[PDB]
Each structure stands twice: as structure tokens, then as C-alpha cells.
Design an enzyme around this catalytic site. Structure first.
Site, PDB file in Angstrom:
ATOM      1  N   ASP A  93      31.169 -26.650 -31.302  1.00 23.15           N
ATOM      2  CA  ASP A  93      31.198 -25.479 -32.177  1.00 23.15           C
ATOM      3  C   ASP A  93      29.988 -25.539 -33.117  1.00 23.15           C
ATOM      4  O   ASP A  93      29.332 -26.574 -33.216  1.00 23.15           O
ATOM      5  CB  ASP A  93      32.522 -25.507 -32.967  1.00 23.15           C
ATOM      6  CG  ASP A  93      32.871 -24.198 -33.632  1.00 23.15           C
ATOM      7  OD1 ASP A  93      32.159 -23.181 -33.476  1.00 23.15           O
ATOM      8  OD2 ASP A  93      33.905 -24.191 -34.347  1.00 23.15           O
ATOM      9  N   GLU A 127      24.452 -23.311 -33.445  1.00 25.12           N
ATOM     10  CA  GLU A 127      23.211 -22.582 -33.722  1.00 25.12           C
ATOM     11  C   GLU A 127      22.053 -23.382 -34.381  1.00 25.12           C
ATOM     12  O   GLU A 127      20.934 -23.301 -33.875  1.00 25.12           O
ATOM     13  CB  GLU A 127      23.520 -21.306 -34.510  1.00 25.12           C
ATOM     14  CG  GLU A 127      24.478 -20.351 -33.791  1.00 25.12           C
ATOM     15  CD  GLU A 127      25.965 -20.684 -33.940  1.00 25.12           C
ATOM     16  OE1 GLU A 127      26.351 -21.486 -34.839  1.00 25.12           O
ATOM     17  OE2 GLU A 127      26.764 -20.150 -33.126  1.00 25.12           O
ATOM     18  N   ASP A 136      32.422 -15.771 -33.480  1.00 26.89           N
ATOM     19  CA  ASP A 136      33.438 -15.295 -34.423  1.00 26.89           C
ATOM     20  C   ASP A 136      33.396 -13.792 -34.661  1.00 26.89           C
ATOM     21  O   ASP A 136      33.300 -13.329 -35.803  1.00 26.89           O
ATOM     22  CB  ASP A 136      33.299 -16.034 -35.753  1.00 26.89           C
ATOM     23  CG  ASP A 136      33.523 -17.532 -35.632  1.00 26.89           C
ATOM     24  OD1 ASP A 136      34.002 -18.019 -34.581  1.00 26.89           O
ATOM     25  OD2 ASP A 136      33.234 -18.227 -36.632  1.00 26.89           O
TER      26      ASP A 136
END
Lengths: 682, 676, 677
Positions: free
Chosen positions: A387, A390, A457
Site C-alpha cells: 500500500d 506512490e 482510495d
């Protein structure tokens, strides 16, 4: 100006500018340009090329030409470059607007003649530093453009759109594009920037870089382009069997008992379940990379029981390292953390002050892997949820952060690839085959590190669902075949709201026909932790229930049949996954991938192909109970829901009750039989 | 080139460069330069000038001149500026090294002729932005330079030194300088930068600014320079009587009962004590600006008992606002907080993620004052400890922060002045007079907001003590008469260590002859809080005891006698404080302030004058039991410790036992009778 | 979040961000935003507003609204802004993609909810300096966008295009846009930057600025939007009569005798000629602004003789000042020149090292005007050719130059407006009325300074002709009614080449129906000067002949009939120019300006209206001898070349021989009578 030509390389030079064009796989060329003394050794996403034997380099008039199979490049005396296919058709041409170029007057009969003074390969020096690069190409009126990665926008064809070349939560820059003109192009440069496919001009921009680098390939079909790209940047591995089943997740199962109750209830109801997930903040602190034994007393016992139940556990990995942990102290000592250029040395403030591990640092990759190995992989966990890939800076001030390989402005977009690489290489070295990890983000070539990417998300709306369809199709074109979403979206779905329940059904139905079928979300009403802090460490909330029985009896029946349908599709899914591994073809794919000779296939953005044999037409609006569906020419189609046969080459005013979305099977494909489609005569 | 001359203003211009010189108080000129269309309205530290008597503007063949009393400025046809006093003597000249200037060939007979191409007023454009300014002046071989603020270095004379123009913990840039050549100069510009008094050239630098701005004044004595400077930037108020007594503090009295027990022990033993202090983290969270009633259950009862005892309470104010507080929410809504240009919006990470209030924002000043007023001043606290006044960024990346008045690069140094201003203006509006707050930092003119400055978180060494003496003296020259230190230094003193105890004694003996006599520190051995966190808020440790009875009997006796001596000094202290208010004279002064015609007074850096009547010669080395003391010519001197009379104009091989530092009284000064 | 509302002003604020919306003319609002302590006093292109009839400011729920006639703005409690017309139709909405905004969680049911974290009003601080501004708005699927100025590209509708906000030779940023949704918007900010009308999001960008500033207006028709914009930034003056005639020019008539022999030959052949032009380098040096008397021995005699012939002389003005001239020394002394931030203090190297005068400096404007006044206007010259108006830096490194008003990055685009202003104010002060000067560039509001803009040094091709048509139409929409080109294009036309001769005729035919009909170019074969240098000053070359008899007898006949046609149109042209002055309507207009209710008028880009009564369908391809032509519904149309009547609402497969392009006249318009009489 000067050409330096050999039998398989074209170099053009003028006043320190060096343009180098060479074969890089069959039907493909690499293009580099620099004003430094030499090209550097950075290959970024490009693997070493298997040699091309019949490369033809020639000179004529004041120009030079290099041909490699079905692509050729011509550079004129003024250093201006264009690309052609084997039929002589123009694929791509540079955009120049000058009166004087390469020490020569521009030709007044050309559209290139202009006092504006724009160069096609603009390496603008940064004072004291490197270069700000703009590579300009002419737009073309017929040109439709696909790929580029994962963008939150309702556009499959991105001609006329501008995309940021940066990584943010719910966005992934995977900068390979496919053009309807018959070429694909990789921007082989991880710099922060932008690509504008504007109607008036195409511009690729790198904020900071040492050199221009791109790869261009030509072929008559989309399938051949996707194959050539996978040969250039790496094939997806073979997907493991378990990954084609149902993945059950939510934010968040707070304890071992809570997770195991859910797993057991799926089995108690004889429901399919292949993967169950422990989401984030199951750990003592960020950067410990282990279970907190107060909520997870015996993780080995959980894993063993789940194995006995035919279920794989996946665990959340966060790339954050909290400055109070032991791993922070050691990783800071070793230089394994990302750095802030200015201000407080903190990259994220979520539930504590943390610093991201530097996924571009080979040492840091190994370090983080070895922690996950000791604490999770050695217990029998085979899947990691990578997770925040980025990474998710609290503030996306890319100028303010630096990695091992340089400033984020220069190299930043490659982070998620390094993050996937850390775990893939570690798991491969530990003896695992058919590795898949769940990645929130990717760069060019992430597919080779078993990166199943999900779209992050997003909110829980029909608007979001429409965007995810386009994004997933474009990700496949960019060479990321393993892709999925949070069924129902991530944020804002109240489990008692009829409007959300309708969205969840439509999204679940679509999810059956995604590369991976995965239920996740942060459902309302949310529940605060009992204690806000424990030993000074902020505690993480949970959302509401998110199991297929959590939304009433009627919705349970629909989702149960979705799960059962997905199980019947598993053999077909595995065949399409094998084809992705073998050929670079995406799993979910636009109509033009399978039907490139049909004009409707290049126009329709709300239908797609789930492998070669299943046409899917999702319902993307609330309250909709029928929709138009184009059936492609060249075969007959079996309605999944009625068993009815319909001829290709027509539109259907198709029924779309809440209980099913329109889906058709290519007549006589092996999958027709595997689905047990029958039509009863009443 | 062109002059535009009026009866009281000289302007010179070439190619958009405008140089403007005008009177700005008696014997003083303001100098500004810009390449923008016009000068802006920023006056920074300069108050409106009283109009001057006998300003004269003259034009000559090539040049123009403006005289204001004892200073004159001459600008030649090439726009080159020099300053002279009333005797025609050169004070200061611009540094130019060019072949071509203001559209004209340079004179090959001048030291100004050079292919190097350095300008005296360099406004170097920042692309897309404002200007990077360098103002260059010729060095002079005989020039001695004083002031500039508070720098952690063993140099009173700073000729040959380079000083950072920025605010950091233990440093204060207060950019007024005094030259032995007979001028003073204020760099009237709050930009981050540097002042280099290099042997080869003097350079003042501003990283980002709109214009050059400085103030220059001339007089025959240091005292007149100090007076003219105080007239330009504001006088210190009159010090209130309580501030001349003993201030007792440590890091930290953790509870109301702990503080009150220390106060009660002073009173039980008939020991002097005027102010007692509650240090930081007595509050629930940063940005609440109130007592945490778990540890301070009845602040009003504490204040009332202290009032009975004849003692004032001072409380720690931190300018931080923790992002979990209610005040953070409101202050963020109103735009009252400092901003990070890039990265996480956090300016400090000490015991929580905080953002500093913006002391350059008049709304934010008022907001913070009103919180302090509600929670402290309304209860009877009338002294505030304005700590972290720089402000103390966790990382001093000045380019990464922005204030209401602009980027910190352009305006940052004025923050501590705004912080003092917030409390001074509020306290005055509430009816308080003779206001004093304890500030960790200052800029030019901070004195007008009652800023008693202390030298911050230095280490506890003799090296540090030597540095503090120089820094305090230079602060006084820079127009900050109310100045003090942590007696013993801040960091590293173990209360059981005899070597630290000797330093403490020497530092305490010096403190008796500082403008304020203040005991503080973070003494070892330190103690962690019982709980590291409470409700997720990180808890603050304490140091060991730091009271005059905490260091054994011998040391108690010496410190007790020091406090008793300070009490007898108080009438003199108040006279000297009144003179600071009236004349701008510092309280602790270099020898040349009182004896400007004596060579030794400009050389000696380890002696000073505490007002005009007391010569102090601190012991600045461990183990030292005597030292050399120069007695200035022009009066006789009475040895404080023996009563012996010595004629001035000689050196004493003076006794300096552990029990006393050498101190002499000007014979027949009123203070002589007060000390006997 | 806090609203500060008065009866005629809406302010919203959070964390020092101030958003201010107020009436600014009828049916119009000004929007400003800053994180500085207050808004500054820069109005840029906006004139003082006429106070509006019935403004209403109200607060409802957590929101506020300001209405001014047919436009309204709504700002919600999160500081997010959208605009609506009098019918409640959404015109323009801000683009937000965040999870947290103005200290509040974003609504998860909105398209605004996103972890991407993009703000609509991004004032990103520049370290040590000002702000890099991005103003983001949602794109709309149906939206067609026009205006923006003059760009060298084959797009009338620029939705999907990205335009540079900067001035370069052949480009003019005039940042007023008109949308098919029923609003117009001025980006009231002269900063270097970009406007991206991408399909996925609309983004306006300023590289360096103090504050966001824009003006938005609403109406049911394009004509009303144009009128409202002209009210806000100023109307064109009335064009003088001579300006509607033929302008004869080339690069370059080198001597008084050469120029006068051309003018005389026009009169000898009984050809129309209203203006003749002395091009650049007729002067001793750059920055002298006078005739070189070696080549121009008696300029006053030339001017008087041309007056006698009914001809106006226009002279080239270059904004350059050579560092060896007396005006350089004086202008340098006074601070009247542009400055280089780094490197040698030279802005252009063309035929000498020069520095541009600073058109943003009011003193420099007056200085240059007074030079031209003394050396040209006092002699009887009434038209100036304000060339190099961008200005044309030898290298367009905008970061490296600074003006009186600030860095070029912050203010650069207003330079051409200052340049036109210098001459218009000076000429007006000297008693001249109906002022027109030929400008190579413009900014918002340049029209009020009599700026006849031309499209600069384009190449001589059919591709360029197509681009020019789109550009001139968009200039009109951006509020510049006086616009023209070099007939034939500027660069590359060989006078002996049949291919160029064909382009010339097509371009000349289009020229007849442009706001000004002007022949100019740098024709090949070019001729080097006799001597490369004279007294160290580099001498300027010339191109070949460029008169209507220079291209053979058959081409002469076509151009002669073009000139005669233009003369018959002059009364109509003057009426349409009066209308431009009175109503802000452009002269050359897209079809939708006159026919806003017809779908084809919003799709067709290769026909236009020359005023309300003439439909023009240029030929834009070599060798084309017919083309398709749509005739708008609502009237009948008279074929200009045959006299045939055709009903509106059909396509014509129309004849387009070399000798004429297809043109139709609105039946019964006064111009029909004028052409047949």
C-alpha cells in the site's frame, strides 16, 4: 550538421546536441538525445534488446534513414525526425517551428517554418543543474491514443487530454501509449512532468533530466504492439491459481479473532473464498513490519487454519517508518530513508511522523524485504499488500524530496516499481514461484515484478465506477494486465443506504469480469478506536462490515451468484492470464484489441472484452435497467443470462435488471460450456 | 546622471537606480536606494524623525552634498557616496571597483578603478522575483566595530568577523553597529543575510529585498551615538523596581506545590527573591496558553500567596500551536499561523507537531495576547517569558517559510520584535506601566517593547561565560540595555560536580553586575517524566534542583552574599536603568563608553563598566585566583572587597579568590556610600 | 470558513486565502483571489466599472451568492465557486480534487472527493518571491471555446487545444475567451503562462503573479458577450476612411524615389491606393526614429505629394535602440530601456546590438512618441507601423528580462498594449482623431489604442492561409476587430513561381473580405545590399517587387478586379467598422455570431461572415476549383459573382474558378444595392 552512421545505428550531431537512433527489439527503435558529452547508462524500463539482424542504415540527399522491420526513422539535414511503417505511412513526426535550425535556414514551404522558435527536442538548461526537457510532436487529426496508466477521468481515448507524469493516491503514470495510427511509444524517463496530447501539438515534459529517451514500436495490430512492448519491458509472470478466486477485505479486521470469524463464516455458508486480508495498523508501530500480538496473539495458528480452509492470508505493508521505532534508527544510520530537501525531516504525518523507505535504494529494498520475510513470509504468508506505493506524501511537493537515484523531480516515478521489485526479488530468492502482490501504483515494467495494481482510495459513486473502467482498460494497454479495484469504491459507502447498495451490486457484477475479483472498502458508519492513543501511538479506526451478507438478503443472493459465477470462470481466467504472460495481451481490454478492423470498436468506451471470448457491457448509472450493447461482427454471441443466441454485427436493446449486467459469450468458445449456460423452454 | 535636490533631500539617479539621502534625526541621515519605480513605504525599525535643525543641501561642479549637523554625505557625479563628520574627517566610504559606472569612465587615478566590476549598491535581480542586495564599503585599517546584537563568539571588537543576519537559539541579529571612527550605522532591513567586516572590504548582504535602507549617525562620543540611535528606534521603558531583584528559575518547577515550596524556602530563610518562574510545559498542550490544572490546581491561590510574600510570578509562553488544539483550528481559520512553503505544514516537532503563530501579523499578535490575558494576566501574572522567540524552527531552512509580511528570506529577522510587541501592546492596553518581558531574541528597536533579552540555551562552560560577556556588551551597543543570561549557563551543569560549582559561582558573581540578576538552567542529573505520554501528548522532563542552597554550604554562603550585595546595588541599578530610558546608554558598557579618550578602553575586552561608577573584572577561567585589572585614568577607585583606594591610570595584580571577583567603585560616586 | 458580505461584494476567506467577487459592468463579475494581506491595485485590462443595476448578495445555508443581472456566482462553505446564468444554467465550475478543503472533510458523494489533492485556486508560493498560479475549472462535454487571440494553428474552436500565454512573432495572447455555454471570460493577468482547454480539465497558469484575477460575463448571444467585453476593456475607435482602402507595402522600398515611383504607377494605371508604406531600416540607426536623408532626401516633399495623390504614408517604427545612438545614451540615463537579468545587456542582435524601449514605462512611452512626433508626425505622417511589438527578443527567455512594471514573467504580455498606447495617446494629444496604427501584437484591451493587428512573419503557403483565417476570426472574438495579414504571407513567395502566384490570388481574394486589405511580403528572389556595412552599421536587404502588376498580366487582371471590388465595398466596410466601435462586434466573424441558433454555424470553420450581410467561403487549397458552401437559414442569398438567388438552409456545390472565391450577399441588404449600383 554531421551524421555518424554504422550498419545498425544512426547518430546526428550539431553543436553538442547528439541524437542517437537504434534498433531495440523487432519492429522497434530506441531514440536518445543529449547535449552532455555522452549518453549516460540509464536504461530505466528497457531490458536488453535481443539483436535485430536486418537493420538497414542509409544516407540520401542531406538525410539519413534507419529501418528495423516494420518501423523506419528518417532524420533530415536539420536534425528533424519522423517515423514510418513498412507501407510508408507516417506514424509520428517531430514538431518544429523555427526559421533557423542546426545552423541552417528552415524551408519556407514547410509547416516547420515559423518565427515562434519551438524545438522538437528542447533540452533547456537549468542554471547550476541539469535540463528541463520538452519533446514536441505534431498532433494528427485521425489519431486516437490509449494507455498512459491509471487516471481518474472518463476517457478511454485520451487524445485531447493532458496527463500528469506523477504518482498520487488513485493515479499511476505508466507512460506507454498506443496510437490508432499503428505505433506504440514508451517515454523511458521517470522524471516528474506531463504529457499533453493536445489537438494542436503533442508535448512530453520532464522537469529535470539528463537526456531524452524513448522507445517506439510499429505493427499492424494492437496485439502485436502489446507483445512488442512486453518483450521490451518484461512479461507479467504466470498468475497463481488462488489469485483468480474471491479476495475478501475491508478497512479493517482489527483482530485475529475478527478476521478468522469472517473466514469461517464464508466456509460455514459454503461460499467461495481464496484470499482474506489483514489491512493496515495491525502492527505495533509503522516500520515494525509485524503483527501486534495484543490483537493478533498467534499469527502462525491463523495462517495454518486458513491454509486448511483453502484460503491465503494477505497482509498490509506500509512503506512508512515511524521515527520512534528501532528500524528507523537502523535505516537512518544506513541511509535507507527518503530525504526532505527542506523543512522538517518527515514525509508523512498519518498516525505519526514517518519517513518512507527509499525503494530506489537496493540496500533499503533488501532491508525492508528481510523484515517482512522474518515477520510474515517465514510464517507462510505468500501475498503482500504493498500500500502507499506512490509514495503518498502528506504534501505532493515533489521538488522537496530526494532519493538514492536523485531528486524526485528527476527519478521519482520509478518508486512503485522499486517497491514491487523489493518483494518480488525477495520472494523469488526465498523459493516462491508465481508471485503476485497487490500494488497501489506502478511505473513502466512493474508487471515483471508481479504487480497486481488497484486503483486506490476513490469515492463510492457511479462517477467513480465509470472512471475505473476507463482506467483499468488503459492500464492494460500500458502493459499492466493484473489490475483491479475496491468493489464498491473505497470512501463513502454507507452499508444501510439503498443508493450505495445499488452501486455495490453494479460494481460487484463488473468485478466478476475484472482480472482480479476483490471486495474492499472503508464503509460507513465508521467506528473510532476505543482508545485514541496507546503508549503515545495513535490508534487506527475501522469502517463498518463489508462481507457479502452485510447488505440484506436480496443483495446477498445477487453477490453469492456473482461469487459462484467467478468460480466457474476460473479456468478461463487462468487461460487468459497465461496468454498475458506469453503474449503481453491485457486481460480486460478495449473492443479494438480483439476487433481492430471494426470502426465501432475504436469508438465504444462502455463495453470491453474480458479475454477473447467474453463481451462485457457494465451498467454505469443508478436506476438503469436496460442499455444499448454492440455485438461485434465475425461471430455469434450467447447471452450469459438467458442462453439466447444473437448474431454479431448488430446493436441490442439489452435487458439489464438489478440481478445481472449484459454479458455475451463467443459462441462455441470453451468457456461457454464451462459456464453451463442453458435455455429452458417453459 | 542626474541630481534632484530640494532644501532637505538629495536624490541621485541613473538608469532607474535611485539613491535618496535625507535627515533622520539630529546628526543623522537615512539612505535608501532602489531600481523599482519608487521607494516603498517600509520604515522597519525607524520611527518618524523629529525635523532637523540646520540641514543644508549643496550642489558642486560634479557632486552634491547634504549636511545634517555633525554628519555630511557627498555624492559625486558617478553616484558614489562618502560620509564625513563636522571636522571634515572621513567616516565611511562606498566600495567601488569598476572601469565604467553611471555611464562614465572611472578615474584611473582612484582605487575605484578596476576591471573586477563590483558595485557599492548591488541590487542583483532575482529571476521572477525581487533583489539580492549587497552594500559594500571600504574597510579601514584603524576601524574597530561594536554592536550587531548577540553572537556566540569571544570578540567584543568584531572587525575581521562575519556575522549571520538571522535569528537562531542563542543568537540575536540587532543590526546596529558603532565604529571607533565616529559613526554608528543601522542596517534597516530585516532580510536574512550577512554582515562581513572583512579586512579587505565591508559587505552587508540581504538575500531577498525590495530596496537598500540604512541609517547613519555621527558624534564625538559613544554616548552621543547611543542617544541618537535610541532617538531613531525608540527608548527602553523605565525598568520596574521588581526586575532589579533576584529572579529564581529552573527547568522546570513541574507543579504548583514544587514552585511554591521553593518560594517558601527563600522566605523562610530571609533570602532575597523578587521573581519566581514557571518554565515550559506547565500547560495541557502547546497553543492552549494556560495552566494544566492537574499539576497547577489553583493558579490564583499560587499568585495570591506569592503576592503576600512580595514575589512576582513569570510564566513561560511558547509561540507554538499544536495542530490538535482548539486554538490551532481557529488560528488556521484566520490565517494567523506561519506557513511552510513546501513539505508538511509543521514548523517544529518538539513534543508534538506545532506551527508558530505569525508575530508579523497584527491579528495574530492580538489573538495570542488575548489568550495570555484571559488565562494569565487577568489572574495577576504581569511578566511573561517569551521563549522560542526566533522562532526556533526544528530546521533553520529560512527559504521554506513565509510570514504575513512576506517570505522569511525578506522579513524574517523582525519576528522577535513582533513577538515582544504583541505582549507589550496588550499589556499597555490593559493599563500596565514599566513593562518588561523576558525575550529570547530581538531585532532593532525591540528595546521599545520592554524586551529583556537573555542569551538562550548555551552550554555550562567557562568558554560560554567568556562569550556571554562579549555578547551582552555588544547587545548594549546595539541598543538593548535590558539583557541577562542563565547564571551557570543552560546546558550541562551537574549540581554535584565541583568543576560546575566553581563556574556557577563565577557566573553568579558576574550576574550581580548584569542588568538583571537571574538564576536559571537545565541542571543534571535530569529526570524523565513518570509517563512519557498522557492522552497522546508527550510529557516534558525536568532537570535537577537549581536553588542557592542546592550546591553545598560554601556555595550557599557565597550566593547568599551575592544576593545581599545585589539588594544594596538596587538604588544604583534603578538610576542606571533610568539613564538607559532617558539617554539610550547601555547598563553594562564597554570601557570606551565611559572612557572614550583612553587607548586601553578600546583594547580591553575582559573588563566593563556596570553603569558609570562600577568597574567589573570577571574571572573567566577555572582555578584562577588572581587577575590583571586596568584602572582607568581620571578618578580614584575603591576596591569593593577591601575598601582600599587606588589611583587610576595603572594596572593592578588583583586578588580574585573564589569568594569575590575584582570590582572597583569610582571614588565619591553616591554608590560608594550605598555599598559600605 | 468565513463570508464577509456587503450589498455589492462577496468575500470568502480561510487561512489567509481571500476570494472576492463583485459586479464589474452589467451582467458581469470580477473574481480575485490572494493569500497576501490584501488585493493589490492592478486592474490590468479592466476599465473602471459602470455601477450595475440590481446586484444582490445573499447567504443561504452554508453558502453565499452574488447575482449581477444575467450572471450569478455561488460559493459554498468549502470556498468552492461556480457560475450560473439568469436561467439557472451552469456556465462554469471550479475543479477540485481533495479529501479535505477549507478545514472541512470533502463530500464523498461529489466528483470533488479525491486523494489527488488539486485545488481550483492554487497560489503556489515561489521561494523568496511571489506565486505560481493555476486556476482549474471542470471541462464540459458540450463546450466549444473561441478567442484567446492569434495562434498559428488550424482550429477555430480551441476546446482540446493548449495555448501559450506569451508574445512571439506571429502570435498574440489576447486572453478573452467566448464559450458556447453562454459566457465569456477574460484572464486579467499579463503573466507569462499557459491556458490548457484539455478534455479532462481546464487550467489557466501564470508563472509569476501576486494574485488571481479574472472577469466573467453572461448573455444569450455572442453579440451581447462581445458588447459586454468591449464595455469592460474599451471599444475600438471609429476607423478613418483611408484605412478601408488598399494598403500597398513590401520589404522594402529602399529610397524615396523607389516608393514614389510605386505610388505614381498605381495612379498612372487608375488603380485604387489609399496607403503606401516605408518598411524598416529607412533610418540611419535603430533608435533614431527618422529618415536617413541619403536615401530619403526630402521626406516632407514625399508626404505632400502623396497627400496630393490621395495617399497616406505609413512608416516603420522599430522599438529597438542601438547602443551607439544618442537616444541610447539618453534613454539609458533615464531608465527607459528593458533590462536583461543576466548576461550581456542586449535584447536583440538583428543588424546591431539593441535594447527594446520599455513600453510599460510611461516615461519611455512619451519619449519614443515625442521622437516619432518630431521626425514623422510633424511632417504629416498619420499612420505608424509599430513592428516588433512583442517584443521580438532574439531569444525568448522570458525569465531573463525585466520591465518597469516587473519581471517579464509577471507582466510581459502587456508590452504590445503599452506600445500601441504610446502612439495613440501621443497622436490624440496632438489633435488627431480616428487613429489607426499597424501593430504586430496585442494584449487585452489593445483595441482601445487603435491597434490594427496583423499576423506577422508567416510563411507563404496554403497551410498558413488556413491558419490565418482561424486566427483572425479568433482575434475578433478576443475583441480585436481591426485585423489583417500580409496578402501572400511574408516569407518564401518567389514572384516567378506559378504555385506561389496561385496562393497569392486566393489570399488576395480573401484579403478583399478582411477588415483591412493589405499587400505585403518579403518576396524572392531577395537582393543583398550593395555594401554590407556603412560606417559600421549593417545595411538592410530588400525582397523582390510586390505590386499587383508584378506577377503577369492574367494575375494583374484578377488583382485589379479585387481592388475595384474592395472600393465598392468601402461604404459597407465603414458601416461594419462603426458597428465595431458602437457594439464591440468584430468585422470578420464566425458563422455563429450572426446565426447562433443554427447547429452548422458552430461546426463550420472554413466560412465566415464579413459583417452581417456577406458570407465568405475562401479557397484554402492549391488547384481547387469548386468547394462545398453552407448557406444559413433565415434569409435568401445572392451569389456575388453570378447574381443568382438561393434560398438559405442548404449546401451549394459551388463554383470556385481561379478568378473568384464563393461569396454570397444577404438578399435585400443595402450592400446588395451598393454592389449592383
Amino acid at each position: 550538421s554531421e551524421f555518424i552512421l554504422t550498419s545498425d545505428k544512426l547518430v546526428w550531431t550539431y553543436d553538442g546536441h547528439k541524437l542517437q537512433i537504434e534498433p531495440w527489439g523487432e519492429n522497434s527503435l530506441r531514440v536518445r538525445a543529449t547535449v552532455a558529452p555522452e549518453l549516460n547508462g540509464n536504461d530505466w524500463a528497457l531490458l536488453p534488446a535481443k539483436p535485430s539482424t536486418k537493420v538497414k542504415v542509409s544516407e540520401f540527399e542531406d538525410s539519413a534513414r534507419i529501418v528495423n522491420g516494420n518501423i523506419s526513422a528518417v532524420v533530415n539535414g536539420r536534425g528533424q525526425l519522423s517515423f514510418y511503417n513498412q507501407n510508408g505511412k507516417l506514424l509520428l513526426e517531430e514538431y518544429w517551428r523555427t526559421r533557423f535550425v542546426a545552423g541552417q535556414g528552415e524551408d519556407t514551404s514547410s509547416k516547420y517554418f515559423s518565427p515562434l522558435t519551438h524545438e522538437a527536442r528542447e533540452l533547456k538548461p537549468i542554471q547550476g543543474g541539469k535540463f528541463e526537457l520538452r519533446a514536441r510532436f505534431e498532433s494528427q487529426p485521425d489519431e486516437r491514443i490509449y494507455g498512459l496508466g491509471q487516471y481518474q477521468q472518463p476517457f478511454l481515448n485520451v487524445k485531447g487530454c493532458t496527463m500528469e507524469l506523477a504518482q498520487r493516491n488513485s493515479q499511476a503514470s505508466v507512460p506507454f501509449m498506443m496510437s490508432s495510427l499503428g505505433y506504440g511509444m514508451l517515454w523511458n524517463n521517470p522524471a516528474i512532468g506531463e504529457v499533453s496530447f493536445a489537438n494542436n501539438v503533442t508535448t512530453w515534459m520532464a522537469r529535470v533530466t539528463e537526456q531524452l529517451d524513448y522507445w517506439i514500436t510499429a505493427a499492424d495490430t494492437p496485439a502485436e504492439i502489446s507483445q512488442q512492448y512486453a518483450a521490451a519491458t518484461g512479461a507479467a509472470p504466470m498468475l497463481p491459481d488462488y489469485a483468480a478466486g474471491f479476495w475478501q477485505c475491508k478497512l479493517r479486521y482489527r483482530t485475529q479473532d475478527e478476521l478468522m470469524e469472517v473466514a469461517r463464516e464464508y466456509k460455514r455458508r459454503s461460499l467461495p473464498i481464496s484470499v482474506i486480508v489483514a489491512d493496515f495498523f495491525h502492527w505495533p508501530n509503522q516500520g515494525d513490519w509485524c503483527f501486534d500480538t495484543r490483537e493478533w496473539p498467534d499469527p502462525k495458528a491463523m495462517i495454518d487454519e486458513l491454509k486448511e480452509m483453502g484460503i491465503e492470508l494477505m497482509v498490509s505493508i506500509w512503506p512508512t517508518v515511524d521515527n520512534r521505532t528501532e528500524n528507523y534508527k537502523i535505516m537512518k544510520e544506513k541511509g535507507y530513508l527518503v530525504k526532505a530537501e527542506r523543512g522538517v525531516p518527515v514525509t508523512m504525518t498519518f498516525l505519526g511522523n514517518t519517513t518512507f523507505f527509499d525503494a530506489t535504494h537496493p540496500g533499503a529494498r533488501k532491508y525492508v524485504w528481510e523484515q517482512a520475510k522474518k515477520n510474515y513470509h517465514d510464517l507462510g504468508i505468500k501475498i503482500f499488500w504493498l500500500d502507499e506505493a506512490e509514495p503518498e506524501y502528506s504534501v505532493y511537493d515533489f521538488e522537496n524530496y530526494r532519493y538514492h537515484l536523485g531528486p524526485v523531480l528527476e527519478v521519482g516515478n520509478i518508486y512503485p516499481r522499486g517497491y514491487a521489485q523489493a518483494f518480488y526479488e525477495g520472494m523469488e530468492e526465498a523459493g516462491q514461484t508465481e508471485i503476485v502482490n497487490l500494488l497501489r501504483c506502478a511505473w513502466a515494467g512493474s508487471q515483471r515484478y508481479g504487480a497486481l495494481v488497484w486503483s486506490g482510495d476513490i469515492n463510492s459513486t457511479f462517477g467513480a465506477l465509470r472512471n475505473q473502467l476507463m482506467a483499468g482498460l488503459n492500464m492494460g494497454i500500458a502493459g499492466i494486465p493484473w489490475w483491479t479495484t475496491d468493489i464498491g469504491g473505497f470512501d463513502g459507502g454507507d452499508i444501510n443506504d439503498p443508493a450505495f447498495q445499488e452501486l455495490l451490486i453494479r460494481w460487484f457484477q463488473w468485478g466478476v469480469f475484472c482480472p482480479v475479483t476483490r471486495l474492499h472498502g472503508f464503509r460507513q458508519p465508521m467506528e473510532e478506536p476505543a482508545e485514541t492513543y496507546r503508549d503515545g501511538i495513535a490508534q487506527c479506526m475501522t469502517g463498518a462490515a463489508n462481507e457479502i451478507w452485510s447488505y440484506g438478503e436480496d443483495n446477498y443472493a445477487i453477490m453469492k451468484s456473482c461469487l459462484e459465477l467467478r468460480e466457474r470462470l476460473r479456468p478461463y481466467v487462468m487461460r487468459v492470464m497465461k496468454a498475458a504472460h506469453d503474449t503481453g495481451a491485457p486481460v480486460m481490454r478495449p473492443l479494438f484489441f480483439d476487433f481492430p478492423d471494426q470502426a465501432e470498436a475504436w469508438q465504444i468506451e462502455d463495453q470491453y472484452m474480458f479475454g477473447p471470448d467474453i463481451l462485457v457491457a457494465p451498467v454505469l448509472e443508478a436506476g438503469q435497467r436496460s442499455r444499448k450493447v454492440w455485438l461485434p461482427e465475425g461471430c455469434a454471441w450467447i447471452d450469459l443470462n438467458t442462453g439466447a443466441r444473437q448474431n454479431g454485427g448488430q446493436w441490442c436493446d439489452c435487458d439489464a435488471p438489478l440481478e445481472a449486467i449484459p454479458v455475451f459469450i463467443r459462441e462455441a468458445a470453451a468457456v461457454q460450456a464451462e459456464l453451463s449456460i442453458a435455455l429452458e423452454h417453459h
